[PDB]
Structure formats: structure tokens, C-alpha cells
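notes to self, project folder thing:

trying the whole complex as one job this time. last attempt i did each chain seperately and stitching them together was a nightmare. two parts in total, labels are on each line so i dont mix them up again. if this works i'll redo the older ones the same way
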Amino acid sequence: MSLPDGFYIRRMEEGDLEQVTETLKVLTTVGTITPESFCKLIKYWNEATVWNDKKIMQYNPMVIVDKRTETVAATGNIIIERKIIHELGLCGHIEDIAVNSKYQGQGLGKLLIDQLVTIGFDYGCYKIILDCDEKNVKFYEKCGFSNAGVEMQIR
Amino acid sequence: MSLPDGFYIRRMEEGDLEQVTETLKVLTTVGTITPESFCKLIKYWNEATVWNDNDKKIMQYNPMVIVDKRTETVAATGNIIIERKIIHELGLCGHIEDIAVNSKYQGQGLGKLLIDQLVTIGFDYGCYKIILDCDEKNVKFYEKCGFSNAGVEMQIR
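result (full assembly):
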């Protein structure tokens, strides 16, 4: 799908390895990943389906691309889960948001989230959640999100 | 598998419909759910797999019910969903969801036992971490289960 000022958004592809690992670095440690592992990863992500006239993908890994040079400007994913509560409802989980360093401050982060949400709600999610740091509560509030709890973790 | 005092933990089954909907109401709105809807839901949960490489089979959904052996009634339920990422070397992240302890079994320490088991399930699969969201009232409880504060949960409905 097309977006303004010459960027567009589409699902991630096997050939995105270099650029995606590069923009994900902004988020954390990505490590060594071989083209083969990646293709298997991408084929899993392209075949994993959520039992539901809709085809529902569990993983929806997006990259926003600068059409100018076909360079990945940002990536984000939304994972779909089917629960029992809410009449066997769907809950979306936005994960791994990263705006590439040379593309910061151009509004792409908010466009990416908007798209992930759109994707989640079209599938029928009764809600979409994500976790963030306090310093980013404001930003997600601008994307229409609300404070809803606390994130707990165990490594 | 078998827990202390006559309780045991296993994967949810199609026959668990009435009791689990009942204990989940403790959490929130469960709604109308036909036995057929449930079996297909159950069939999905028992078929959905997380791509590995090799010889251990990873289930995306791990819907557990702690059962009172005395009367085969569900004392509690919890689930840990398994996600595969690109970060952390195509890492695995566990996400604990929908924890509920049945009303007639509150205060028996089942909640903590349930959490401990989900964590074990996730770590055996290889998760580099396991996360969940909760209310501030329950931060203390999750701190006792070995979790630590990690961020803020945002939602949009």
C-alpha cells in the first residue's frame, strides 16, 4: 500500500534481511542471521494462519519503504492471537517497532502504528495492545492508545 | 504434571468448556460459546505450531487448566503464547495471558503455581524472556512469581 511523500508499506520479504536487521538494531541486539534461517523465518511468517471469509495471518511484519531507493525506513509487526474471552475474540499485539535512524522525525512511526492498528481491527481484534517505556507513553497516546496496565517480564 | 494436595495441571480439552468459561468470567466477559466453536478453537490450539528447525515441537498456544483431582473440577487457567522474532537471533518470546483462579479456589496458592508452570513451559521451549501485563494492584504478586517491572502496557480498542 502507498503512503505519502514517496514511501509505501508492504509485508516483509526474504530479501529484506540486511536492511531490516539494520533498522532493528536501533531497538536492540539482532545478531547473526543467515539468509537461510531468514527465508525459513519468512516462510513461517507467510504461512502461519489464525483459525477464524477472512484469511488471518498470525504475523504481520511490515516495512515502510522509501520508494526513491527502495530502502527500508521502518519496520513493525502485529501478532494476532485468538482467545476464549470476548466470544472467542482476537487480540492484536504490536511488537518490534523501529524507525530507521536516517528516517527519524519524518512521521513514519505514527504512520506505521496506524497501519498495524488498521490491519488488526480489519481482522476483527476487539483490542490491540503493546508495551512501551514511559518516555514513549505520549507518542502512543498520539496514535490513539491509552494506558492500560503494567508490563512484567522475566528473562 | 501432578501438583501438591490433589491438584494436577494439563492442557485444556474440548470438554473443559463449561468450567473454563466459568472461571474465566472471574477475569472478564466470556459470552456465548457453542461446543462446536470451542472444539474448533481447541483443534486450532492443538495444531498451531511455531517453526523450529529440528527435534522439539513448539506449540504457539499452551492453554493450561489446574484441575482438582478430587472432583475433576477446574481450579485455575492460564495460557502462554509463543512468539518468534527476528531480534535475539530469531529469538522466542513467551506471552502469558488470561490467568484466572476459580472463585472457590482463591487463596490456595494455585495462581503462583500456575504462573511458575507457564514460565517453565516457556523457558523449556527456549524463550529468552516471558512477558505479561497486569494491574498495578498485582505488581506485588508478579514480583513474588519472579517477574520485574519492565514497562507500560498501552491499548486501543
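what i see at first glance: The beta strands of chain A are 7-11, 62-66, 71-82, 90-99, 125-132, 146-154.
need to look closer tmrw
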